Amino acid sequence: MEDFVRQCFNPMIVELAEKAMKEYGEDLKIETNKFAAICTHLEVCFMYSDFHFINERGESIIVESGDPNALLKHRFEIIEGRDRTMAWTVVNSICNTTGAEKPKFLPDLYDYKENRFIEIGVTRREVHIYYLEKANKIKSEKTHIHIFSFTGEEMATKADYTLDEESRARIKTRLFTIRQEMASRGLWDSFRQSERGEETIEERF
Amino acid sequence: GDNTKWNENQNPRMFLAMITYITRNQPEWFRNVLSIAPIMFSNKMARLGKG
Amino acid sequence: PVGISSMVEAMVSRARIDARIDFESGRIKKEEFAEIMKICSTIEELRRQ
Amino acid sequence: NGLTANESGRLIDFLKDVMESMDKEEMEITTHFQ
Amino acid sequence: GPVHFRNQVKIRRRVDINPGHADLSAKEAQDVIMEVVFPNEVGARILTSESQLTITKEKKEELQDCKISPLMVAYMLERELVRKTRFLPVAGGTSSVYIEVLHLTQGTCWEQMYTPGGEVRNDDVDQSL
Description:
part of a larger assembly, 5 chains, A: alpha+beta, four-stranded mixed beta sheet, 4 strands, globular, B: mainly alpha, RNA-directed RNA polymerase catalytic subunit (chain D), Polymerase basic protein 2 (chain E), Polymerase acidic protein (chain A)
């Protein structure tokens, strides 16, 4: 599986994936499905964030590629793929600037129009059980939730969707491509089996 | 009282035995990490000195 | 300090966040924010090379 | 030498690297001269 | 007041050395110190307790522009807020203000009557009563 996940994803995402998995002392060889899960999470967050910039107002204007100008402002500061210390220092900076609320668990991004955090998730199991798991995990929450599925159906709170439908279609295309190359590789089910194992990692000395 | 040649007679193999007894019914990784030090002391070498 | 991020990566990212938050509400106006972001991009490029 | 788990800043990873250095067929040190 | 020459039954006992401790442990009070001095580098630690929250607001005002060193300001709040205990041979006393002068109030054969300057809390006084 390592060969495929090293080939398809660009080096920035696989780099951040070893970065994040190593942060906790997990071994890429004894735990291999986790590396692919992390790579998919990183890629989907980056895709959800990229191709979005802000104007003087809100209602993000979309571009094929960013234009060279003073509009350097980016719509989403990607908290994911960051060190824990810097992740919580960016979170604290945001909370001290906008006076927002401090979450109990690490969010994944922050949006300024609705002025709050967002927690993207990716799951093998279909939506309406992982969603309620994440919801009853993140208690007393304002962070919007936006979970995807490899099949192609998503869900969220307040039926709220924070961006265009073409970007969602792009995410869904990427996930279906991955899924129906897994079907060819036979890896898919291997990933499926270990979701429960994902919750926690056991020390191995 | 006092003990003559206290350190000379304190074998690291009995420290390994004591560590193995103390760490009974525990995750094997913890037993190994705590056992490693007596293992290194049992095979330890001493530099002779300046000359 | 604790973390796993390299010296230059942490320093440049922290400075980037500081420039962003200062531009949104602080002393930094567009000129200094742009200069800081450009210099940080130069640092990142020099790091990768 | 390639034992970089100790960059995790955890004592147990530094001990894993110390233990994994012994199963290497060649260490690489550096010595000063003048 | 008068020195009373008498046998001192100095009973070794754990006694609080610090006299301004806000009843917060070293780890417990390092997070209030950080929230006061270093508000962006606190991490995930949310200061639930109300006592810590009042301490933060009150202490922030005093140190608005201090230009000595933020490390020294942090060690300051460590001294004021961090609790500290030490086994010491104590006879009588047992108070925060009466243990800092234990070299002056207590000896081997002599007692020295003494009354610190600070306005004493009435809880200690009624306990003694």
